[model samples]
Target: AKITFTNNCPNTVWPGTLTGDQKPQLSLTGFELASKASRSVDAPSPWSGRFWGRTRCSTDAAGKFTCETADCGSGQVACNGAGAVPPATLVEITIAANGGQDYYDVSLVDGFNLPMSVAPQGGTGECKPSSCPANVNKVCPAPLQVKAADGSVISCKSACLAFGDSKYCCTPPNNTPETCPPTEYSEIFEKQCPQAYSYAYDDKNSTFTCSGGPDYVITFCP
Candidate 1:
């Protein structure tokens, strides 16, 4: 199946891609996608990975590429084989796998940078869309906010990432579904993006599936 990303954030976005199990990388690990522009990449079957949008990026004094939110820390636009740092909205998918179906979702489990959606195209068996179309940074709480030099919120940090506690991280003793119930902070994200994963344990309602190896179209907004 193919994955297409369209930028609709009113600004350019650097999209990062990562594959699971260190398999062969996609055509572009990362690239600059201007507003209203779109790009597509095809992946072999049995592929699993995540995609994220990095914002507020430019060359630093050292001539290294840096992004304000969701920086992959590769010193270049291409993320290479690295994954995104915390607080970035992610469109995660496992395509042409288990029982010959495709699974996908939009996750705020790591946090949020901007609006994102995974839209299934012409697939059978419940090929519904998964999206987080709201600009969550604007609603992010003060403590969870990742700000820009101009004092504008650029991203939102997940409670688990910001606090790093067992309660929020859902680690060790709190790893079970029962033990890791939603928190006040997670509820805030859940309410805003009910179709996406708000926390580590948000799988039941957020996970979506499709048959026929349908192509996916991801948009930065809506």
Candidate 2:
């Protein structure tokens, strides 16, 4: 199977992907998708990982790429197992899982950078689109706003990344699901992206699954 990426916005976006730590990683590590351009990469069965877009990127003659948002710190185009920094909207997927199902969702748990959508193609059994398609930067709180060189808000950070509170991170001493509860900060994100993950323990409403083989299309600025 393959996961196709489409840049549907006016600006160019570098789509980055990172496979899980397990062996046999899929080949869809990273690439730049120009405005309105599309690229499809191999995603073998049983693969699992997350995807996101990098914006306002520039490369020198030496080919050293740097992005204003969602830079993976690889210092290059390929992610090489590097996950996106927080505030980058994500499309997460686990393909060919138990019962011949594919689980996928758009997640704002790390926060929001660009608008995005994950749509299943030719799938059956509860295969629905999951997206955080809103422009969250406009309403981003001042404390969590990521600014660009031009003084424009480029991303909205999650409360955990911004504050690093045990309550928001669901970390040790408060790791249990019951101990970690949503806060006003998380609620703001949830209200904007109800179908996407808003916090660490938001699985009940965010996780989604569909049976049967299905290709996926992930779009940036959707």
Candidate 3:
């Protein structure tokens, strides 16, 4: 199956990708994507990975590439083997090799830097789309806010990422879904982006699946 990454924001964004399993690898790990532009990546069977977009990226005096948000720290356009930094919007997917369904989600468990949507087309078994289209940065609480140089909120941090508390991180005894219930901070994210995964244990309405090897499109600022 092939996945398309589209940038819909007014400004440009650099998209980064990470492979989680030792399965098929994609052609490109990262690339510069301008507004209204789209790129595609082909994946063989049983590919499990995640994708995120980096904003406000530029090369420094030392010629190192850095972004204000979601920078993979590869110092180049390509992630090369790095994962996205926390507090960035992500699209996670797992393609099944055998006769099973492909699972995917637009996850805010790491947090949200921008709106994102995942659309599965030409597939079987209720190929519904998942999207987090709200401007979470605008409504993010002060405690979880990441500000820019001009004092504008750029990203919203998950309570787990911001505080690292056992309750928020779902650590130890709170690891189970029943024990790690949503907190006020997560509720705020859920209240805004109801279709996205607000926390680690949000699997009921957050997970999506498709069969028959459908093509997926991930859109930024959707």
Candidate 4:
């Protein structure tokens, strides 16, 4: 289990903190400054040797495994191991800043909460570039709209829009989920309430209600 951070900032931004509390579902180990083309940290996977490494009850016809949070019960997110010799998945996370302006990057690792890299406490740190020859840091802001044949638009504001050729915003190939349509939106639900498993509020009906926050998993919101 290795954790790394890719710096996508055009210039230098020092000491970017990765607070474990700031991002639920993700556990932080430590962070280092990865240059413009470098990685922030490369350490062991935290959740390694954990339950995720042992669960082997579900697999698709092609050996593409599937694990649904619902199967694990509510308040959980599914994780699948595609079964590569050294199975790997790239997870995209937002290092959000003030006013929704920030950098984007992908982590080629195992589970989402496996491990994370961030600026060390009271240390001189920042993300530098990587040597991959390709930049995985920069990303276009969202709120992009995609129009269907019937003129119905799907406004993907939280993430970039990759609906059709005519209206697709170029994103990293590894930035997509294992599922084709990326229907697994657990991240979206977590984003809605970074500090809680669920968020509840009152609606017009005078009843407490909630939506799939962050990734939008609706459970027990009555």
Each prediction's TM-score versus the true structure? 0.95, 0.92, 0.96, 0.19
| lDDT of candidates 1 onward, in order | 0.89, 0.85, 0.88, 0.23
For 1-222, candidate 4 gives per-residue lDDT tens digits of 123344443432121222232233334221222235343332221211111111122455756433321122211123222121111112222332322222222222222211122211211123221111121112212332322355543122223222332111223443333212322232342343232211111011111111111111111110
Lowest-sum lDDT 10-residue window in model 4: 213-222
lDDT of 4 at 12: 23
Question: In angstroms, how far off is 197's CA in candidate 3?
Answer: 0.4
The number of the candidate with the highest lDDT is 1
**Model 1, 14-123: lDDT tens per residue?**
99999897688888889999999999988788899999999999999999999998999999999998888878999998888643778889999899998999988877
Please say which candidate is ahead in TM-score: 1 or 3.
Answer: 3
Residue 105 in candidate 1, Cα distance off native in Å: 0.4
The global Cα lDDT (0 to 1) of model 4 is 0.23
lDDT of 3: 0.88
Give candidate 1 regions above 4 Å deviation. none
Compared with the true structure, model 3 gives a TM-score of 0.96
Top candidate by TM-score: 3
Q: Give all candidate RMSDs, comma-separated.
A: 1.5, 1.9, 1.3, 19.6
Residue-level lDDT tens digits of model 2 in 130-218: 88878999999999999987899999999998999999899987798899888898898888888788888876542376777788899
Question: lDDT-based ranking, best first?
Answer: 1, 3, 2, 4
